[PDB]
Assembly symmetry: C3
Homo-oligomer: 179 residues x 3
Protein backbone atom coordinates (compact mmCIF):
# COMPACT_ATOMS: atom_id res chain seq x y z
CA UNK A 1 0.00 0.00 0.00
CA UNK A 2 2.64 2.41 -1.16
CA UNK A 3 2.91 4.53 1.98
CA UNK A 4 3.94 1.88 4.52
CA UNK A 5 7.61 1.87 3.54
CA UNK A 6 7.96 5.56 4.35
CA UNK A 7 6.06 5.03 7.61
CA UNK A 8 8.18 1.97 8.36
CA UNK A 9 11.47 3.72 7.57
CA UNK A 10 10.44 6.75 9.64
CA UNK A 11 9.53 4.70 12.71
CA UNK A 12 12.73 2.68 12.37
CA UNK A 13 14.59 6.00 12.41
CA UNK A 14 12.73 6.91 15.60
CA UNK A 15 13.78 3.61 17.18
CA UNK A 16 17.34 4.05 15.89
CA UNK A 17 17.44 7.48 17.51
CA UNK A 18 16.14 5.99 20.76
CA UNK A 19 18.74 3.21 20.71
CA UNK A 20 21.44 5.77 19.93
CA UNK A 21 20.50 7.86 22.96
CA UNK A 22 20.39 4.80 25.22
CA UNK A 23 23.79 3.49 24.11
CA UNK A 24 25.29 6.92 24.81
CA UNK A 25 23.96 6.94 28.37
CA UNK A 26 25.06 3.34 28.96
CA UNK A 27 28.51 4.30 27.66
CA UNK A 28 28.60 7.25 30.07
CA UNK A 29 27.65 5.03 33.01
CA UNK A 30 30.06 2.20 32.21
CA UNK A 31 32.94 4.62 31.59
CA UNK A 32 32.27 6.14 35.02
CA UNK A 33 31.93 2.72 36.63
CA UNK A 34 35.31 1.81 35.14
CA UNK A 35 36.97 4.63 37.09
CA UNK A 36 35.06 3.78 40.27
CA UNK A 37 35.82 0.05 40.19
CA UNK A 38 39.47 0.84 39.45
CA UNK A 39 39.52 3.20 42.43
CA UNK A 40 37.79 0.75 44.77
CA UNK A 41 40.23 -2.04 43.93
CA UNK A 42 43.17 0.28 44.55
CA UNK A 43 41.74 1.27 47.94
CA UNK A 44 41.05 -2.34 48.92
CA UNK A 45 44.63 -3.25 48.01
CA UNK A 46 45.90 -0.35 50.11
CA UNK A 47 43.60 -1.34 52.98
CA UNK A 48 45.00 -4.88 53.01
CA UNK A 49 48.53 -3.49 53.35
CA UNK A 50 47.80 -1.48 56.50
CA UNK A 51 45.64 -4.21 58.03
CA UNK A 52 48.40 -6.75 57.37
CA UNK A 53 50.80 -4.32 59.02
CA UNK A 54 48.36 -3.96 61.92
CA UNK A 55 48.13 -7.74 62.27
CA UNK A 56 51.92 -7.78 62.37
CA UNK A 57 51.93 -5.32 65.25
CA UNK A 58 49.09 -6.91 67.23
CA UNK A 59 50.58 -10.40 67.48
CA UNK A 60 53.88 -8.79 68.49
CA UNK A 61 52.09 -6.77 71.17
CA UNK A 62 50.34 -9.91 72.40
CA UNK A 63 53.75 -11.53 72.65
CA UNK A 64 55.19 -8.63 74.65
CA UNK A 65 52.14 -8.37 76.93
CA UNK A 66 52.39 -12.08 77.70
CA UNK A 67 56.11 -11.67 78.39
CA UNK A 68 55.45 -8.66 80.62
CA UNK A 69 52.72 -10.52 82.51
CA UNK A 70 55.27 -13.24 83.21
CA UNK A 71 57.87 -10.80 84.53
CA UNK A 72 55.45 -8.95 86.80
CA UNK A 73 54.17 -12.20 88.32
CA UNK A 74 57.75 -13.23 89.08
CA UNK A 75 58.42 -9.78 90.51
CA UNK A 76 55.22 -9.92 92.57
CA UNK A 77 56.33 -13.23 94.09
CA UNK A 78 59.81 -11.89 94.83
CA UNK A 79 58.21 -8.90 96.53
CA UNK A 80 55.95 -11.17 98.58
CA UNK A 81 58.98 -13.22 99.62
CA UNK A 82 60.89 -10.08 100.61
CA UNK A 83 57.96 -8.72 102.61
CA UNK A 84 57.63 -11.87 104.71
CA UNK A 85 61.36 -12.30 105.22
CA UNK A 86 62.98 -8.87 105.61
CA UNK A 87 63.93 -7.09 108.84
CA UNK A 88 62.01 -3.84 109.31
CA UNK A 89 63.26 -0.52 110.69
CA UNK A 90 59.76 0.55 111.73
CA UNK A 91 58.15 -2.68 112.98
CA UNK A 92 57.50 -2.62 116.73
CA UNK A 93 56.96 -6.33 117.40
CA UNK A 94 60.18 -8.19 118.23
CA UNK A 95 61.97 -9.62 115.19
CA UNK A 96 63.97 -12.85 115.26
CA UNK A 97 66.83 -14.12 113.11
CA UNK A 98 67.59 -17.79 112.47
CA UNK A 99 71.25 -16.90 112.04
CA UNK A 100 74.23 -15.34 113.79
CA UNK A 101 74.62 -11.57 113.45
CA UNK A 102 77.74 -9.45 113.05
CA UNK A 103 77.80 -5.66 112.93
CA UNK A 104 80.37 -2.87 112.73
CA UNK A 105 81.61 -1.00 115.79
CA UNK A 106 78.64 -1.15 118.17
CA UNK A 107 75.34 -2.60 119.30
CA UNK A 108 72.97 -0.11 120.91
CA UNK A 109 69.71 -0.11 122.91
CA UNK A 110 67.48 2.97 122.92
CA UNK A 111 70.12 5.24 121.39
CA UNK A 112 72.88 4.46 123.90
CA UNK A 113 75.89 2.25 123.15
CA UNK A 114 75.70 -0.93 125.23
CA UNK A 115 78.11 -3.23 123.39
CA UNK A 116 81.23 -2.88 121.25
CA UNK A 117 84.43 -4.54 120.06
CA UNK A 118 85.95 -7.26 122.24
CA UNK A 119 88.12 -5.87 125.05
CA UNK A 120 91.64 -7.28 124.84
CA UNK A 121 94.76 -7.51 127.00
CA UNK A 122 93.30 -9.82 129.62
CA UNK A 123 95.30 -12.59 131.25
CA UNK A 124 92.75 -15.27 132.10
CA UNK A 125 92.22 -15.90 135.80
CA UNK A 126 92.97 -19.40 137.08
CA UNK A 127 91.49 -21.56 139.82
CA UNK A 128 87.99 -22.10 141.19
CA UNK A 129 84.96 -20.18 139.93
CA UNK A 130 82.22 -19.40 142.45
CA UNK A 131 78.65 -19.34 141.15
CA UNK A 132 77.10 -20.70 144.33
CA UNK A 133 75.77 -19.20 147.55
CA UNK A 134 77.24 -15.74 148.14
CA UNK A 135 76.28 -13.30 150.89
CA UNK A 136 77.63 -9.79 150.33
CA UNK A 137 76.32 -8.79 153.75
CA UNK A 138 78.70 -11.27 155.35
CA UNK A 139 80.51 -9.41 158.13
CA UNK A 140 83.45 -10.23 160.40
CA UNK A 141 84.22 -10.15 164.11
CA UNK A 142 87.41 -8.31 165.04
CA UNK A 143 88.62 -8.62 168.63
CA UNK A 144 90.98 -6.41 170.62
CA UNK A 145 93.30 -9.42 170.74
CA UNK A 146 94.58 -11.70 167.98
CA UNK A 147 92.08 -14.45 167.16
CA UNK A 148 93.07 -17.11 164.62
CA UNK A 149 89.48 -18.04 163.77
CA UNK A 150 88.59 -14.41 163.07
CA UNK A 151 91.52 -14.02 160.68
CA UNK A 152 90.63 -17.35 159.08
CA UNK A 153 87.09 -16.13 158.41
CA UNK A 154 88.41 -13.02 156.68
CA UNK A 155 90.77 -15.11 154.55
CA UNK A 156 88.02 -17.61 153.73
CA UNK A 157 85.70 -14.85 152.53
CA UNK A 158 88.51 -13.31 150.50
CA UNK A 159 88.91 -16.64 148.73
CA UNK A 160 85.19 -17.01 147.97
CA UNK A 161 85.26 -13.41 146.74
CA UNK A 162 88.21 -13.97 144.40
CA UNK A 163 86.55 -17.15 143.15
CA UNK A 164 83.36 -15.19 142.48
CA UNK A 165 85.38 -12.62 140.53
CA UNK A 166 86.85 -15.46 138.46
CA UNK A 167 83.36 -16.87 137.87
CA UNK A 168 82.18 -13.51 136.54
CA UNK A 169 85.32 -13.22 134.40
CA UNK A 170 84.55 -16.65 132.94
CA UNK A 171 81.11 -15.43 131.87
CA UNK A 172 82.47 -12.36 130.08
CA UNK A 173 85.14 -14.40 128.29
CA UNK A 174 82.66 -17.12 127.26
CA UNK A 175 80.28 -14.48 125.89
CA UNK A 176 83.17 -12.67 124.26
CA UNK A 177 83.14 -9.28 125.96
CA UNK A 178 86.73 -9.93 127.00
CA UNK A 179 89.53 -12.09 125.58
CA UNK B 1 12.34 10.30 -5.71
CA UNK B 2 12.84 6.60 -6.18
CA UNK B 3 16.41 6.34 -4.92
CA UNK B 4 15.99 7.62 -1.36
CA UNK B 5 14.67 4.34 0.04
CA UNK B 6 17.82 2.49 -0.99
CA UNK B 7 19.95 5.32 0.41
CA UNK B 8 17.84 5.37 3.57
CA UNK B 9 17.99 1.59 4.04
CA UNK B 10 21.74 1.58 3.40
CA UNK B 11 22.47 4.31 5.96
CA UNK B 12 20.19 2.61 8.49
CA UNK B 13 22.29 -0.52 7.96
CA UNK B 14 25.41 1.55 8.64
CA UNK B 15 23.87 2.83 11.87
CA UNK B 16 22.68 -0.67 12.78
CA UNK B 17 26.24 -1.94 12.29
CA UNK B 18 27.55 0.88 14.48
CA UNK B 19 25.03 0.14 17.23
CA UNK B 20 25.87 -3.56 16.98
CA UNK B 21 29.58 -2.87 17.50
CA UNK B 22 28.88 -0.55 20.44
CA UNK B 23 26.57 -3.00 22.22
CA UNK B 24 29.25 -5.69 21.88
CA UNK B 25 31.87 -3.49 23.54
CA UNK B 26 29.46 -2.42 26.28
CA UNK B 27 28.66 -6.09 26.87
CA UNK B 28 32.38 -6.86 27.13
CA UNK B 29 32.90 -4.05 29.65
CA UNK B 30 29.88 -4.86 31.81
CA UNK B 31 30.70 -8.58 31.85
CA UNK B 32 34.20 -7.70 33.06
CA UNK B 33 32.85 -5.23 35.61
CA UNK B 34 30.59 -7.99 36.92
CA UNK B 35 33.63 -10.10 37.81
CA UNK B 36 35.48 -7.13 39.30
CA UNK B 37 32.58 -5.92 41.46
CA UNK B 38 31.99 -9.50 42.62
CA UNK B 39 35.68 -9.76 43.54
CA UNK B 40 35.77 -6.40 45.33
CA UNK B 41 32.74 -7.26 47.46
CA UNK B 42 34.31 -10.60 48.41
CA UNK B 43 37.54 -8.85 49.43
CA UNK B 44 35.70 -6.19 51.45
CA UNK B 45 33.78 -8.93 53.26
CA UNK B 46 37.05 -10.72 54.00
CA UNK B 47 38.66 -7.46 55.13
CA UNK B 48 35.86 -6.83 57.63
CA UNK B 49 36.45 -10.27 59.16
CA UNK B 50 40.13 -9.67 59.92
CA UNK B 51 39.56 -6.08 61.07
CA UNK B 52 36.78 -7.27 63.38
CA UNK B 53 39.21 -9.89 64.67
CA UNK B 54 41.84 -7.18 65.09
CA UNK B 55 39.37 -5.01 67.01
CA UNK B 56 38.72 -8.02 69.22
CA UNK B 57 42.42 -8.33 69.99
CA UNK B 58 43.09 -4.62 70.51
CA UNK B 59 40.46 -4.01 73.19
CA UNK B 60 41.70 -7.16 74.94
CA UNK B 61 45.27 -5.86 74.78
CA UNK B 62 44.13 -2.50 76.14
CA UNK B 63 42.50 -4.38 79.00
CA UNK B 64 45.67 -6.34 79.76
CA UNK B 65 47.93 -3.28 79.47
CA UNK B 66 45.70 -1.40 81.92
CA UNK B 67 45.78 -4.39 84.26
CA UNK B 68 49.57 -4.64 83.95
CA UNK B 69 49.98 -0.91 84.60
CA UNK B 70 48.00 -1.41 87.81
CA UNK B 71 50.17 -4.30 88.98
CA UNK B 72 53.46 -2.52 88.28
CA UNK B 73 52.35 0.60 90.15
CA UNK B 74 51.46 -1.55 93.15
CA UNK B 75 54.79 -3.34 92.84
CA UNK B 76 56.64 -0.02 92.51
CA UNK B 77 55.05 1.19 95.75
CA UNK B 78 55.88 -2.05 97.56
CA UNK B 79 59.47 -1.70 96.37
CA UNK B 80 59.59 1.91 97.59
CA UNK B 81 58.24 0.80 100.97
CA UNK B 82 60.83 -1.98 101.20
CA UNK B 83 63.68 0.35 100.26
CA UNK B 84 62.86 2.84 103.01
CA UNK B 85 62.20 0.21 105.64
CA UNK B 86 64.65 -2.68 105.17
CA UNK B 87 67.92 -3.30 107.03
CA UNK B 88 70.93 -3.20 104.71
CA UNK B 89 74.03 -5.42 104.75
CA UNK B 90 76.13 -2.78 102.99
CA UNK B 91 74.92 0.51 104.48
CA UNK B 92 77.57 2.20 106.62
CA UNK B 93 75.42 4.68 108.55
CA UNK B 94 74.04 3.26 111.81
CA UNK B 95 70.66 1.55 111.44
CA UNK B 96 68.01 1.56 114.15
CA UNK B 97 65.13 -0.81 114.91
CA UNK B 98 61.91 0.19 116.66
CA UNK B 99 61.60 -3.35 117.99
CA UNK B 100 63.36 -5.98 120.10
CA UNK B 101 65.79 -8.27 118.27
CA UNK B 102 66.49 -11.97 118.73
CA UNK B 103 69.16 -13.93 116.86
CA UNK B 104 70.58 -17.45 116.82
CA UNK B 105 73.74 -18.41 118.69
CA UNK B 106 75.75 -15.17 118.71
CA UNK B 107 76.05 -11.43 118.32
CA UNK B 108 79.35 -10.23 116.89
CA UNK B 109 81.28 -6.95 116.42
CA UNK B 110 83.92 -6.67 113.70
CA UNK B 111 84.07 -10.42 113.05
CA UNK B 112 84.67 -11.46 116.67
CA UNK B 113 82.03 -13.05 118.91
CA UNK B 114 81.13 -10.66 121.73
CA UNK B 115 77.81 -12.05 122.94
CA UNK B 116 76.07 -15.43 123.07
CA UNK B 117 73.50 -17.58 124.84
CA UNK B 118 72.70 -16.77 128.48
CA UNK B 119 75.17 -18.31 130.92
CA UNK B 120 73.38 -20.54 133.43
CA UNK B 121 74.08 -22.26 136.74
CA UNK B 122 74.41 -19.10 138.81
CA UNK B 123 73.13 -18.84 142.36
CA UNK B 124 72.20 -15.18 142.79
CA UNK B 125 74.31 -13.25 145.30
CA UNK B 126 72.49 -11.73 148.26
CA UNK B 127 73.01 -8.59 150.33
CA UNK B 128 74.16 -5.05 149.55
CA UNK B 129 75.27 -3.96 146.09
CA UNK B 130 78.00 -1.32 145.88
CA UNK B 131 77.83 1.12 142.98
CA UNK B 132 79.24 4.06 144.92
CA UNK B 133 82.72 5.42 145.63
CA UNK B 134 85.35 2.71 145.19
CA UNK B 135 89.12 3.15 145.35
CA UNK B 136 91.04 0.15 144.03
CA UNK B 137 94.28 1.80 145.14
CA UNK B 138 93.11 1.60 148.74
CA UNK B 139 95.98 0.11 150.74
CA UNK B 140 96.36 -1.14 154.31
CA UNK B 141 98.74 -0.62 157.21
CA UNK B 142 100.12 -3.82 158.74
CA UNK B 143 102.06 -3.51 161.99
CA UNK B 144 104.55 -5.87 163.60
CA UNK B 145 102.03 -6.23 166.42
CA UNK B 146 98.31 -7.01 166.36
CA UNK B 147 96.23 -3.89 165.73
CA UNK B 148 92.43 -4.19 165.84
CA UNK B 149 91.84 -1.09 163.71
CA UNK B 150 94.17 -2.38 160.99
CA UNK B 151 92.33 -5.71 160.83
CA UNK B 152 89.01 -3.85 160.85
CA UNK B 153 90.10 -1.80 157.84
CA UNK B 154 90.96 -4.96 155.90
CA UNK B 155 87.60 -6.51 156.79
CA UNK B 156 85.75 -3.31 155.90
CA UNK B 157 87.37 -3.18 152.46
CA UNK B 158 86.63 -6.86 151.92
CA UNK B 159 82.96 -6.10 152.55
CA UNK B 160 82.87 -3.15 150.13
CA UNK B 161 84.65 -5.37 147.61
CA UNK B 162 82.16 -8.23 147.95
CA UNK B 163 79.32 -5.72 147.70
CA UNK B 164 80.87 -4.32 144.52
CA UNK B 165 81.07 -7.84 143.10
CA UNK B 166 77.37 -8.28 143.89
CA UNK B 167 76.59 -4.95 142.21
CA UNK B 168 78.36 -6.08 139.04
CA UNK B 169 76.57 -9.44 139.21
CA UNK B 170 73.25 -7.59 139.44
CA UNK B 171 74.06 -5.75 136.20
CA UNK B 172 74.85 -8.94 134.28
CA UNK B 173 71.69 -10.66 135.54
CA UNK B 174 69.49 -7.63 134.76
CA UNK B 175 70.93 -7.45 131.24
CA UNK B 176 70.62 -11.20 130.89
CA UNK B 177 74.22 -12.32 130.39
CA UNK B 178 73.78 -14.57 133.42
CA UNK B 179 70.77 -16.21 135.06
CA UNK C 1 13.77 -6.59 -7.62
CA UNK C 2 10.69 -5.31 -5.88
CA UNK C 3 10.68 -7.67 -2.91
CA UNK C 4 14.06 -6.83 -1.34
CA UNK C 5 12.85 -3.70 0.43
CA UNK C 6 10.25 -5.66 2.39
CA UNK C 7 12.85 -8.34 3.16
CA UNK C 8 15.36 -5.64 4.10
CA UNK C 9 12.91 -3.75 6.31
CA UNK C 10 11.80 -6.99 7.99
CA UNK C 11 15.34 -8.11 8.81
CA UNK C 12 16.20 -4.62 10.06
CA UNK C 13 13.20 -4.94 12.38
CA UNK C 14 14.59 -8.27 13.59
CA UNK C 15 17.94 -6.64 14.31
CA UNK C 16 16.23 -3.65 15.93
CA UNK C 17 14.34 -6.05 18.20
CA UNK C 18 17.60 -7.82 19.06
CA UNK C 19 19.35 -4.54 19.86
CA UNK C 20 16.34 -3.47 21.95
CA UNK C 21 16.52 -6.64 24.03
CA UNK C 22 20.28 -6.29 24.52
CA UNK C 23 20.10 -2.64 25.61
CA UNK C 24 17.45 -3.59 28.17
CA UNK C 25 19.66 -6.27 29.70
CA UNK C 26 22.70 -3.98 29.69
CA UNK C 27 20.58 -1.33 31.40
CA UNK C 28 19.52 -3.88 34.03
CA UNK C 29 23.13 -4.88 34.68
CA UNK C 30 24.53 -1.35 34.84
CA UNK C 31 21.71 -0.16 37.11
CA UNK C 32 22.51 -3.04 39.46
CA UNK C 33 26.24 -2.37 39.24
CA UNK C 34 25.53 1.25 40.19
CA UNK C 35 24.04 0.12 43.50
CA UNK C 36 26.85 -2.38 44.12
CA UNK C 37 29.69 0.06 43.38
CA UNK C 38 27.97 2.67 45.56
CA UNK C 39 27.71 0.11 48.36
CA UNK C 40 31.33 -1.06 48.01
CA UNK C 41 32.67 2.50 48.17
CA UNK C 42 30.60 3.18 51.29
CA UNK C 43 31.95 0.03 52.95
CA UNK C 44 35.55 0.85 52.00
CA UNK C 45 35.13 4.33 53.47
CA UNK C 46 33.72 2.80 56.66
CA UNK C 47 36.55 0.25 56.76
CA UNK C 48 39.17 3.00 56.58
CA UNK C 49 37.60 4.70 59.60
CA UNK C 50 37.86 1.67 61.88
CA UNK C 51 41.33 0.72 60.61
CA UNK C 52 42.51 4.30 61.19
CA UNK C 53 41.03 4.04 64.68
CA UNK C 54 42.80 0.71 65.13
CA UNK C 55 46.10 2.24 64.01
CA UNK C 56 45.50 4.96 66.59
CA UNK C 57 45.11 2.36 69.32
CA UNK C 58 48.02 0.14 68.27
CA UNK C 59 50.72 2.83 68.32
CA UNK C 60 49.38 3.94 71.71
CA UNK C 61 49.56 0.36 72.98
CA UNK C 62 53.11 0.05 71.64
CA UNK C 63 53.95 3.21 73.57
CA UNK C 64 52.45 1.85 76.79
CA UNK C 65 54.07 -1.58 76.39
CA UNK C 66 57.46 0.07 75.90
CA UNK C 67 56.83 2.23 78.96
CA UNK C 68 55.76 -0.81 80.99
CA UNK C 69 58.82 -2.78 79.87
CA UNK C 70 60.95 0.09 81.18
CA UNK C 71 59.24 0.13 84.57
CA UNK C 72 59.46 -3.63 85.08
CA UNK C 73 63.18 -3.68 84.22
CA UNK C 74 63.77 -0.94 86.79
CA UNK C 75 61.66 -2.85 89.30
CA UNK C 76 63.51 -6.09 88.52
CA UNK C 77 66.83 -4.37 89.23
CA UNK C 78 65.54 -2.87 92.48
CA UNK C 79 64.35 -6.32 93.51
CA UNK C 80 67.75 -7.82 92.67
CA UNK C 81 69.44 -5.10 94.74
CA UNK C 82 67.10 -5.75 97.68
CA UNK C 83 67.66 -9.51 97.51
CA UNK C 84 71.44 -9.20 97.72
CA UNK C 85 71.40 -6.53 100.40
CA UNK C 86 68.54 -7.23 102.83
CA UNK C 87 68.73 -8.98 106.21
CA UNK C 88 66.72 -12.20 106.28
CA UNK C 89 64.58 -13.60 109.11
CA UNK C 90 64.93 -17.16 107.83
CA UNK C 91 68.53 -17.33 106.57
CA UNK C 92 70.70 -19.63 108.69
CA UNK C 93 74.17 -18.51 107.60
CA UNK C 94 75.56 -15.65 109.72
CA UNK C 95 74.68 -12.19 108.40
CA UNK C 96 76.98 -9.18 108.75
CA UNK C 97 76.28 -5.44 108.79
CA UNK C 98 78.75 -2.77 107.69
CA UNK C 99 77.13 -0.35 110.12
CA UNK C 100 76.31 0.20 113.78
CA UNK C 101 72.99 -1.22 115.01
CA UNK C 102 70.48 0.19 117.49
CA UNK C 103 67.34 -1.59 118.65
CA UNK C 104 64.51 -1.02 121.11
CA UNK C 105 64.48 -2.51 124.60
CA UNK C 106 66.48 -5.73 124.19
CA UNK C 107 68.87 -7.95 122.30
CA UNK C 108 68.19 -11.66 122.60
CA UNK C 109 69.90 -14.99 121.78
CA UNK C 110 67.82 -18.14 121.29
CA UNK C 111 64.65 -16.61 122.73
CA UNK C 112 66.18 -15.42 126.01
CA UNK C 113 67.00 -11.79 126.81
CA UNK C 114 70.77 -11.35 127.07
CA UNK C 115 71.17 -7.58 126.70
CA UNK C 116 69.12 -4.47 127.44
CA UNK C 117 69.21 -0.76 128.23
CA UNK C 118 72.36 0.64 129.86
CA UNK C 119 72.41 0.18 133.63
CA UNK C 120 72.79 3.52 135.39
CA UNK C 121 73.62 4.86 138.84
CA UNK C 122 77.22 3.70 138.91
CA UNK C 123 80.01 5.73 140.47
CA UNK C 124 83.12 4.80 138.49
CA UNK C 125 85.80 2.95 140.44
CA UNK C 126 89.20 4.61 140.70
CA UNK C 127 92.75 3.29 140.87
CA UNK C 128 94.59 0.36 139.30
CA UNK C 129 92.88 -2.18 137.05
CA UNK C 130 94.16 -5.76 137.17
CA UNK C 131 94.03 -7.75 133.94
CA UNK C 132 97.19 -9.73 134.64
CA UNK C 133 98.02 -12.98 136.40
CA UNK C 134 95.28 -13.91 138.88
CA UNK C 135 95.02 -17.13 140.88
CA UNK C 136 91.62 -17.62 142.51
CA UNK C 137 92.97 -20.71 144.27
CA UNK C 138 95.43 -18.52 146.15
CA UNK C 139 95.15 -19.46 149.82
CA UNK C 140 96.55 -18.02 153.05
CA UNK C 141 98.42 -19.28 156.09
CA UNK C 142 96.87 -18.32 159.43
CA UNK C 143 98.91 -19.01 162.56
CA UNK C 144 97.80 -19.35 166.18
CA UNK C 145 99.89 -16.24 166.85
CA UNK C 146 99.95 -12.86 165.10
CA UNK C 147 102.18 -12.92 162.02
CA UNK C 148 102.73 -9.66 160.11
CA UNK C 149 103.66 -11.40 156.85
CA UNK C 150 100.49 -13.51 156.94
CA UNK C 151 98.30 -10.43 157.40
CA UNK C 152 100.27 -8.65 154.66
CA UNK C 153 99.56 -11.50 152.25
CA UNK C 154 95.82 -11.26 152.94
CA UNK C 155 95.90 -7.49 152.41
CA UNK C 156 97.97 -7.85 149.23
CA UNK C 157 95.49 -10.33 147.75
CA UNK C 158 92.59 -8.08 148.74
CA UNK C 159 94.22 -5.29 146.74
CA UNK C 160 94.77 -7.44 143.65
CA UNK C 161 91.16 -8.58 144.00
CA UNK C 162 89.77 -5.04 144.21
CA UNK C 163 91.94 -4.07 141.24
CA UNK C 164 90.56 -7.03 139.29
CA UNK C 165 87.03 -5.90 140.14
CA UNK C 166 87.90 -2.44 138.81
CA UNK C 167 89.34 -3.98 135.64
CA UNK C 168 86.10 -5.86 135.03
CA UNK C 169 84.09 -2.71 135.76
CA UNK C 170 86.19 -0.86 133.17
CA UNK C 171 85.23 -3.45 130.55
CA UNK C 172 81.50 -3.12 131.22
CA UNK C 173 81.66 0.68 131.14
CA UNK C 174 83.74 0.72 127.92
CA UNK C 175 81.27 -1.66 126.26
CA UNK C 176 78.37 0.33 127.65
CA UNK C 177 76.58 -2.18 129.86
CA UNK C 178 77.04 0.25 132.74
CA UNK C 179 77.49 4.02 132.96
CA1 LIG D 1 14.50 0.47 6.71
CL1 LIG E 1 33.49 -2.04 43.22
Amino acid sequence: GAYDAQVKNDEQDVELADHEARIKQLRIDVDDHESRITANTKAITALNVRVTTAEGEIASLQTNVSALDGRVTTAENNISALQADYVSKTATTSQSLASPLNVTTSYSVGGKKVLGARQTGWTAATGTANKGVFDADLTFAVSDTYTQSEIQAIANALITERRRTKAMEDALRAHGLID
